[PDB]
JSON list of C-alpha atoms in Angstrom, two decimals:
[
{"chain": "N", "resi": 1, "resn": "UNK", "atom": "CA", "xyz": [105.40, -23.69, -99.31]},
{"chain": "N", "resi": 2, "resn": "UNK", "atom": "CA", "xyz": [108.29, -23.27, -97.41]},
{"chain": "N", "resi": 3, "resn": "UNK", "atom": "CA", "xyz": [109.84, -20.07, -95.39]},
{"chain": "N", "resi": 4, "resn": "UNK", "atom": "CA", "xyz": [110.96, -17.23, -97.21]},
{"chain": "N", "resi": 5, "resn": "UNK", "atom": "CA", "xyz": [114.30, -17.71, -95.51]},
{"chain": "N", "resi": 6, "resn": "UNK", "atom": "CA", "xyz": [114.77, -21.11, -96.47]},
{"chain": "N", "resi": 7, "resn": "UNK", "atom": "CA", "xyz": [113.51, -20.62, -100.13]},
{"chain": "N", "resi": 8, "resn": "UNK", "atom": "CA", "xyz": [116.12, -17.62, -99.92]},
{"chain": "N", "resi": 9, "resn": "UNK", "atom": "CA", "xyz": [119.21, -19.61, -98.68]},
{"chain": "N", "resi": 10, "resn": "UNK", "atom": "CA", "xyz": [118.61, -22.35, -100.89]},
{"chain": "N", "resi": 11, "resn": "UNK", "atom": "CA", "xyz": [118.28, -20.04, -103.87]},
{"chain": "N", "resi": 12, "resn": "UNK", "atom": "CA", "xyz": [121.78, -18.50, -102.95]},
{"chain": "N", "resi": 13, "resn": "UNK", "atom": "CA", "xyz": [122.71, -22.09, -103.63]},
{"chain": "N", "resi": 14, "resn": "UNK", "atom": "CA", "xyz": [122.18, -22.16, -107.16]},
{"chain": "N", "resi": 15, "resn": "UNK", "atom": "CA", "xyz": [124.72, -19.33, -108.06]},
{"chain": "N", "resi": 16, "resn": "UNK", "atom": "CA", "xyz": [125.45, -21.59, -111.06]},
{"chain": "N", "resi": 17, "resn": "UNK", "atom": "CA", "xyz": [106.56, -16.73, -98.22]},
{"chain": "N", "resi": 18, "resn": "UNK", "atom": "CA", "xyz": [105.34, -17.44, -94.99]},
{"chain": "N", "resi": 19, "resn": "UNK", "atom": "CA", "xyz": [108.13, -16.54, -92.45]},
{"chain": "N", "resi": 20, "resn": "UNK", "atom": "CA", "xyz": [110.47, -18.65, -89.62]},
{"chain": "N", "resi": 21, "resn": "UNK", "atom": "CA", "xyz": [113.36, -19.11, -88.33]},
{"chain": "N", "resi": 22, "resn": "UNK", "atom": "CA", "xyz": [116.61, -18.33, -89.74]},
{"chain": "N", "resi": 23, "resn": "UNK", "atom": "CA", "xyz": [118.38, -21.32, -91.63]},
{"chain": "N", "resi": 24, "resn": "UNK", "atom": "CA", "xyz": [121.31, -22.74, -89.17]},
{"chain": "N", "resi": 25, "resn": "UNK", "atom": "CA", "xyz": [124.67, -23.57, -90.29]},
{"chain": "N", "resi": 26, "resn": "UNK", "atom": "CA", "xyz": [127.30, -26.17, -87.82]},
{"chain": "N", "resi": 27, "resn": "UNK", "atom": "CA", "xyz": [130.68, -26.36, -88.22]},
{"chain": "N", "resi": 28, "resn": "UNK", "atom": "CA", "xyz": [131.57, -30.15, -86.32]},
{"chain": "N", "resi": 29, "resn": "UNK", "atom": "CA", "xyz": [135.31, -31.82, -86.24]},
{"chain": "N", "resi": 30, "resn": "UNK", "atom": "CA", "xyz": [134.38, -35.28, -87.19]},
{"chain": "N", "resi": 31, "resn": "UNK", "atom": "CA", "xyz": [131.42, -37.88, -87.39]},
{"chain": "N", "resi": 32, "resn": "UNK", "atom": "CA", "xyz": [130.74, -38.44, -83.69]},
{"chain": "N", "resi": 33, "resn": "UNK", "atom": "CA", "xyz": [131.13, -34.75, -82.19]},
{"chain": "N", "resi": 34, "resn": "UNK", "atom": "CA", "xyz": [128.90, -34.44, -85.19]},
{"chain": "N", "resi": 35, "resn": "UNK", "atom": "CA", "xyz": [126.16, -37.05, -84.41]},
{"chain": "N", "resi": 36, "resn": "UNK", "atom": "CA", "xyz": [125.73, -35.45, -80.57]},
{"chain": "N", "resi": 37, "resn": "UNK", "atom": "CA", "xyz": [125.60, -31.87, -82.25]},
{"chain": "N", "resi": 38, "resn": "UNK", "atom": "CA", "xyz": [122.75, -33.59, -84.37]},
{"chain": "N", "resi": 39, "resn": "UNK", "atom": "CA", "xyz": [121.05, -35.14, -81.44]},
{"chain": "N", "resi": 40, "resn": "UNK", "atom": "CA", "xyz": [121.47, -31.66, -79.36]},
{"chain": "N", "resi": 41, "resn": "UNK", "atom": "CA", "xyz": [119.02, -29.76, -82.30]},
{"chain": "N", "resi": 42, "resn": "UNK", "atom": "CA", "xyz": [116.97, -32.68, -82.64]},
{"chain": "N", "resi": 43, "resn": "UNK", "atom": "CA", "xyz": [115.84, -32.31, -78.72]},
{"chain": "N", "resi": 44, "resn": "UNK", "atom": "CA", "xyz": [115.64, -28.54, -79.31]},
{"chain": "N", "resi": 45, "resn": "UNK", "atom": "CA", "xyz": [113.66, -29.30, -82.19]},
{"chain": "N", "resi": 46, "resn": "UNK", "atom": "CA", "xyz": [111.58, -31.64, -80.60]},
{"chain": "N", "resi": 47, "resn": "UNK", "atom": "CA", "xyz": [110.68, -28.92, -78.25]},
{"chain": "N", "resi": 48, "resn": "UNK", "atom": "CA", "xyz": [109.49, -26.26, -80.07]},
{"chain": "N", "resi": 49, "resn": "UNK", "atom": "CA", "xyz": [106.86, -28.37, -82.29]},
{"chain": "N", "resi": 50, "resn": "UNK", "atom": "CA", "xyz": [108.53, -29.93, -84.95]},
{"chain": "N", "resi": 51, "resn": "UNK", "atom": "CA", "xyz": [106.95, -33.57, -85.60]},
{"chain": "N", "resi": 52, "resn": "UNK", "atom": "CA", "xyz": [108.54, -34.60, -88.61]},
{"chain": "N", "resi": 53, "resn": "UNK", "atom": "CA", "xyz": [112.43, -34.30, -88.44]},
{"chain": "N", "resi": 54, "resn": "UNK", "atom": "CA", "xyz": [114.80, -35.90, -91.47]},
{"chain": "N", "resi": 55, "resn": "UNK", "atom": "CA", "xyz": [118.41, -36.09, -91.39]},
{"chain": "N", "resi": 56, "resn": "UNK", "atom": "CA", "xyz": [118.65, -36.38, -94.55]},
{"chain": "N", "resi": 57, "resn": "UNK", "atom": "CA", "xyz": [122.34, -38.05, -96.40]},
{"chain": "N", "resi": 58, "resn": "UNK", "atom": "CA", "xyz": [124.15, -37.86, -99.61]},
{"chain": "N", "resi": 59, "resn": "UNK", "atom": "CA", "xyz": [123.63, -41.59, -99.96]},
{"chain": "N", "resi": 60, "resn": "UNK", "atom": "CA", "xyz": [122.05, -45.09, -98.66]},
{"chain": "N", "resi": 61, "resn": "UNK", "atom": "CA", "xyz": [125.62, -45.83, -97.64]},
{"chain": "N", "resi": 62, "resn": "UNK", "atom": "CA", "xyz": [125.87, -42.61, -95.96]},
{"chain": "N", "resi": 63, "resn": "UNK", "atom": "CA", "xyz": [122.24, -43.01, -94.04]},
{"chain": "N", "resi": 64, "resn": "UNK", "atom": "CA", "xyz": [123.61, -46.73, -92.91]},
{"chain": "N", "resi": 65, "resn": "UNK", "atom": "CA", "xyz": [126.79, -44.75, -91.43]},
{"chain": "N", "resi": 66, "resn": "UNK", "atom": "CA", "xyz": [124.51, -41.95, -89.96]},
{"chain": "N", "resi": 67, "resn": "UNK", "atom": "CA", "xyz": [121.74, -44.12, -88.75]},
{"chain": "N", "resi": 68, "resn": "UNK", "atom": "CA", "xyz": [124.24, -46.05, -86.31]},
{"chain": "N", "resi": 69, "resn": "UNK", "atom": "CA", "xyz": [126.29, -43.70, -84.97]},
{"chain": "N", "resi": 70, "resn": "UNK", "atom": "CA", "xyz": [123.37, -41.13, -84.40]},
{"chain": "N", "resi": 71, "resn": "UNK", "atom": "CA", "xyz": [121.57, -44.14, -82.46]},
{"chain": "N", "resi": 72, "resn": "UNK", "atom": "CA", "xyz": [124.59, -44.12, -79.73]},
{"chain": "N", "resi": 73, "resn": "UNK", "atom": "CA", "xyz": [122.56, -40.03, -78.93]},
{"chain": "N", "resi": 74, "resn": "UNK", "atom": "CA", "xyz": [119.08, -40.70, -79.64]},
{"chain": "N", "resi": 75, "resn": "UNK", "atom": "CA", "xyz": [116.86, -42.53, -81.56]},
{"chain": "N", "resi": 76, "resn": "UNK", "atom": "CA", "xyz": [115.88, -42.49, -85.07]},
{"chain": "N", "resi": 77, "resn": "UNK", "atom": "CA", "xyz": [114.49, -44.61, -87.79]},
{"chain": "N", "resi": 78, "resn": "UNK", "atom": "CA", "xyz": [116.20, -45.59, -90.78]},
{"chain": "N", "resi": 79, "resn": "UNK", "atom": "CA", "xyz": [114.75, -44.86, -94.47]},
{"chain": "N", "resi": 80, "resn": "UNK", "atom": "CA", "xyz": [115.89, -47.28, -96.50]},
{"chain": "N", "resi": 81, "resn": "UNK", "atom": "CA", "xyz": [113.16, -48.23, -99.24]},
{"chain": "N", "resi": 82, "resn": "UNK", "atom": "CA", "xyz": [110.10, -46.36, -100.55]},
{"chain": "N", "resi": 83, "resn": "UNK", "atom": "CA", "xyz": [107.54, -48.67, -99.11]},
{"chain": "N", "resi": 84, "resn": "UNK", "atom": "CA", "xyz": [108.49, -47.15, -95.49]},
{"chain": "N", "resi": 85, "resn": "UNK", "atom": "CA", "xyz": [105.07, -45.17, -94.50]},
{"chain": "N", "resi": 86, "resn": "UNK", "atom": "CA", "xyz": [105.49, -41.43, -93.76]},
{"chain": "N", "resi": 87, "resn": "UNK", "atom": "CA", "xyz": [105.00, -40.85, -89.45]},
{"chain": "N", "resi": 88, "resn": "UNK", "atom": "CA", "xyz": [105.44, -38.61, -87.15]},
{"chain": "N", "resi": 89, "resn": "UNK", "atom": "CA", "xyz": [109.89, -38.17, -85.63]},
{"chain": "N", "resi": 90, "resn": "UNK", "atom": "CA", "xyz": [113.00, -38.54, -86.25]},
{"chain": "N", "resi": 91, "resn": "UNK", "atom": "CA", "xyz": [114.45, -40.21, -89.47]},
{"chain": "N", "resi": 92, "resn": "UNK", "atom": "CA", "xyz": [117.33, -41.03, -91.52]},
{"chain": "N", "resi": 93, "resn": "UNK", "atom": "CA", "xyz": [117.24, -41.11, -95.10]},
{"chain": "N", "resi": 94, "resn": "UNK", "atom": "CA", "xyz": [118.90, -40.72, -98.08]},
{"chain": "N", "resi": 95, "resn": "UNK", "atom": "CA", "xyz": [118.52, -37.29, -100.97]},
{"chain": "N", "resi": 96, "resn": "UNK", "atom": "CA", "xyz": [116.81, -39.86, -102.99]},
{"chain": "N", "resi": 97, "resn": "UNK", "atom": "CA", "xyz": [114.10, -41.48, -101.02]},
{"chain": "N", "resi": 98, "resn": "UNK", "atom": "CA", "xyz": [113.51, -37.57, -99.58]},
{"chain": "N", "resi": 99, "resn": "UNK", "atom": "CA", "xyz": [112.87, -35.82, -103.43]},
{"chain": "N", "resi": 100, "resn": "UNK", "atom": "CA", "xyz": [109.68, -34.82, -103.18]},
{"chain": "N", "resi": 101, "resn": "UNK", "atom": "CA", "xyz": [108.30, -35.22, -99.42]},
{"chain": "N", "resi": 102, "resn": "UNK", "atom": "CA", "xyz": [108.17, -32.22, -96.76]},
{"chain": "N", "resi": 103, "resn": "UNK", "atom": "CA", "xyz": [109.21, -32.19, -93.08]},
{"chain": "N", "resi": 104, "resn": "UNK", "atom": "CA", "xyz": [108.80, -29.62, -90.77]},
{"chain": "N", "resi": 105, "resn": "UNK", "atom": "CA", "xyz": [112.39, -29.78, -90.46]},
{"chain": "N", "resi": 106, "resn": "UNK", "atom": "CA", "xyz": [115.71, -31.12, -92.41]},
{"chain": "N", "resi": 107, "resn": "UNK", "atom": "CA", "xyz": [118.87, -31.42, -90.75]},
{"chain": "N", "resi": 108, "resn": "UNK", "atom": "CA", "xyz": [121.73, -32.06, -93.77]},
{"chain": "N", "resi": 109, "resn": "UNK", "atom": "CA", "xyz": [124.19, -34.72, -92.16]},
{"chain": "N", "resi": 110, "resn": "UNK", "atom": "CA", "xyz": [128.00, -33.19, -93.48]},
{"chain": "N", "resi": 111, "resn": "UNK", "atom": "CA", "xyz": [127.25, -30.79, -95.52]},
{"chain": "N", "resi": 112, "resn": "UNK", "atom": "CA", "xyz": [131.35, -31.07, -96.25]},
{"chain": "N", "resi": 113, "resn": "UNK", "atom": "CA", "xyz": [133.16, -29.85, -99.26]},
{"chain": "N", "resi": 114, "resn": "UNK", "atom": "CA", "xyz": [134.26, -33.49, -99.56]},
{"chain": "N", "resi": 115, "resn": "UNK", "atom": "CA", "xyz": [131.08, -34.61, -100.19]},
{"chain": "N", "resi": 116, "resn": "UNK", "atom": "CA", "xyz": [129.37, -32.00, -101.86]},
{"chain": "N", "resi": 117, "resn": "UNK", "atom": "CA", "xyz": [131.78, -30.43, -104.67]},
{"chain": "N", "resi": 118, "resn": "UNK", "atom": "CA", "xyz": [130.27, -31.12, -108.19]},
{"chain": "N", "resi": 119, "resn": "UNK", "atom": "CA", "xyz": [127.20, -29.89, -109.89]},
{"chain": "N", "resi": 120, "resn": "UNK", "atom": "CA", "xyz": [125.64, -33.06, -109.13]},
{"chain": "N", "resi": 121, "resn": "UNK", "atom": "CA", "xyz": [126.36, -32.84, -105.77]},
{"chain": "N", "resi": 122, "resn": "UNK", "atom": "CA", "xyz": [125.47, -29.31, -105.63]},
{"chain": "N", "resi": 123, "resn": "UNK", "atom": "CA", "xyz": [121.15, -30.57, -106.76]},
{"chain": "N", "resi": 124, "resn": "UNK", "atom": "CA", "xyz": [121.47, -33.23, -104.24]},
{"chain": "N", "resi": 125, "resn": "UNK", "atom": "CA", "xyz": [121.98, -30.54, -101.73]},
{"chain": "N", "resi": 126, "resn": "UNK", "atom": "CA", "xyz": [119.60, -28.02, -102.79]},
{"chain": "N", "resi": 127, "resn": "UNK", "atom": "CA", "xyz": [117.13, -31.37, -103.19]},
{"chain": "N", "resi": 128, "resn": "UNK", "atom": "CA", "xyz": [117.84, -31.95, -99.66]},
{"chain": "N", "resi": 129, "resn": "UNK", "atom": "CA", "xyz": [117.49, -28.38, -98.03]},
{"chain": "N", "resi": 130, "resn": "UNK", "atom": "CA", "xyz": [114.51, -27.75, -100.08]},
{"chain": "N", "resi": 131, "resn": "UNK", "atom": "CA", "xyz": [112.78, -30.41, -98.21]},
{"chain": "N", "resi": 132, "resn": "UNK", "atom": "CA", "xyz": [112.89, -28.42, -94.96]},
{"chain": "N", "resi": 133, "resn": "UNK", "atom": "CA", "xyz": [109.06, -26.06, -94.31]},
{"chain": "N", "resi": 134, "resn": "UNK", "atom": "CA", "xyz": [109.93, -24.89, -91.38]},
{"chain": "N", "resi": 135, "resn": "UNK", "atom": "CA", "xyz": [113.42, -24.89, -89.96]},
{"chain": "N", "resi": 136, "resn": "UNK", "atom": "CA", "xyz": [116.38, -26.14, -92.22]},
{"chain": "N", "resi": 137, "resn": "UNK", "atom": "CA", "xyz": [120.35, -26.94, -90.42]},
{"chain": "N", "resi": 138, "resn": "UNK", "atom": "CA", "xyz": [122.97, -27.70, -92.13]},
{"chain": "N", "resi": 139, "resn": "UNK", "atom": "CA", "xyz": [125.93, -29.86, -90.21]},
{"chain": "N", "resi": 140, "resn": "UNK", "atom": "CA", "xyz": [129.90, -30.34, -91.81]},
{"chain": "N", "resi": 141, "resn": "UNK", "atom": "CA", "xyz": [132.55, -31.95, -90.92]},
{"chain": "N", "resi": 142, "resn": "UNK", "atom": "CA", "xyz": [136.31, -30.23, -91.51]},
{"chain": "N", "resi": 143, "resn": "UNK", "atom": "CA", "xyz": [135.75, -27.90, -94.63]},
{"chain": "N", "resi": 144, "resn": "UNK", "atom": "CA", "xyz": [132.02, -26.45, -95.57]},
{"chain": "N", "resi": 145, "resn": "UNK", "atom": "CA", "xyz": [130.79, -27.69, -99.16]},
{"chain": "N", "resi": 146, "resn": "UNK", "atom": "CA", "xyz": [131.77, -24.93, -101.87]},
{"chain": "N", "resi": 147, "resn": "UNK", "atom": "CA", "xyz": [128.08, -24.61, -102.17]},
{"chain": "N", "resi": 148, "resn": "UNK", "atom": "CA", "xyz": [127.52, -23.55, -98.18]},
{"chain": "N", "resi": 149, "resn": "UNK", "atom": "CA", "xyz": [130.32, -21.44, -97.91]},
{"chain": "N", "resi": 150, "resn": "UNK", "atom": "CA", "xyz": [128.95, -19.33, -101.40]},
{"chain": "N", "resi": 151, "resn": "UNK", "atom": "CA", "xyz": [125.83, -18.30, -99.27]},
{"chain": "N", "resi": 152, "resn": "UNK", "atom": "CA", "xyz": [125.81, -14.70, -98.04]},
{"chain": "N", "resi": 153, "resn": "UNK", "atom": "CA", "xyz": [126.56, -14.45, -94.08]},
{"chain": "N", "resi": 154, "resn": "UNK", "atom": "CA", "xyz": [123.23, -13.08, -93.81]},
{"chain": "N", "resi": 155, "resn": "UNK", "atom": "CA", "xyz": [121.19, -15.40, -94.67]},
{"chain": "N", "resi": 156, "resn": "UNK", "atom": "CA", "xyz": [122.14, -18.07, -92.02]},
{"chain": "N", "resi": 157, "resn": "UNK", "atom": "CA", "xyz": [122.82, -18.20, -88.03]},
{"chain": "N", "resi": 158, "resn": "UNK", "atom": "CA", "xyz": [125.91, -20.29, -86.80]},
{"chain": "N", "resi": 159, "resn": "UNK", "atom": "CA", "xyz": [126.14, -22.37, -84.17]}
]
């Protein structure tokens, strides 16, 4: 139900239809240049239709972290428990609370090799891409997660 270049850049993930726009890849140097990069796509985003934007985290702990320093760029509304109704924006929310709901699209908040190095971590982030339809980005800090840097170059733009 998603792109075919999303489906196929996810895919490349697990080394171990309709169409869009090619899955976008950030390299940031830390949390805050980060969280303005994030708030930059968001407004692009914004622009071009999407309604239902996640920034989606490794962790509640990570969405707490997230949630306030993205707030000093824009603002966004934190998912922190399952009773939280599904609207229309910009969210934060954690791998867990985002298995099995859709947005338009999924921005993955430090997609870093320091958070995302075991097989675990490798179907949290193939959970969390997957939940992208239309447009999917993927943000790190430092070093890119084993898992991003094993995609071909040709399935993703850089930014």
């Amino acid at each position: 139900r998603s792109t075919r270049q999303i489906v196929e850049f996810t895919k490349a993930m697990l080394q171990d239809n309709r169409s869009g726009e090619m899955p976008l890849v950030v390299k940031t140097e830390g949390h805050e240049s980060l969280c303005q990069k994030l708030a930059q796509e968001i407004g692009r985003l914004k622009k071009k239709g999407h309604e239902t934007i996640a920034v989606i985290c490794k962790t509640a702990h990570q969405c707490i972290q997230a949630h306030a320093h993205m707030s000093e760029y824009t603002d966004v509304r934190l998912i922190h428990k399952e009773n939280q109704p599904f609207q229309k924006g910009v969210c934060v929310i954690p791998v867990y609370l985002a298995k099995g709901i859709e947005f338009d699209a999924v921005l993955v908040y430090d997609a870093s090799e320091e958070h995302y190095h075991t097989e675990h971590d490798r179907r949290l982030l193939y959970t969390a891409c997957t939940r992208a339809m239309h447009m999917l980005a993927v943000f790190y800090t430092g070093e890119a997660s084993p898992f991003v840097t094993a995609v071909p170059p040709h399935l993703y733009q850089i930014a």
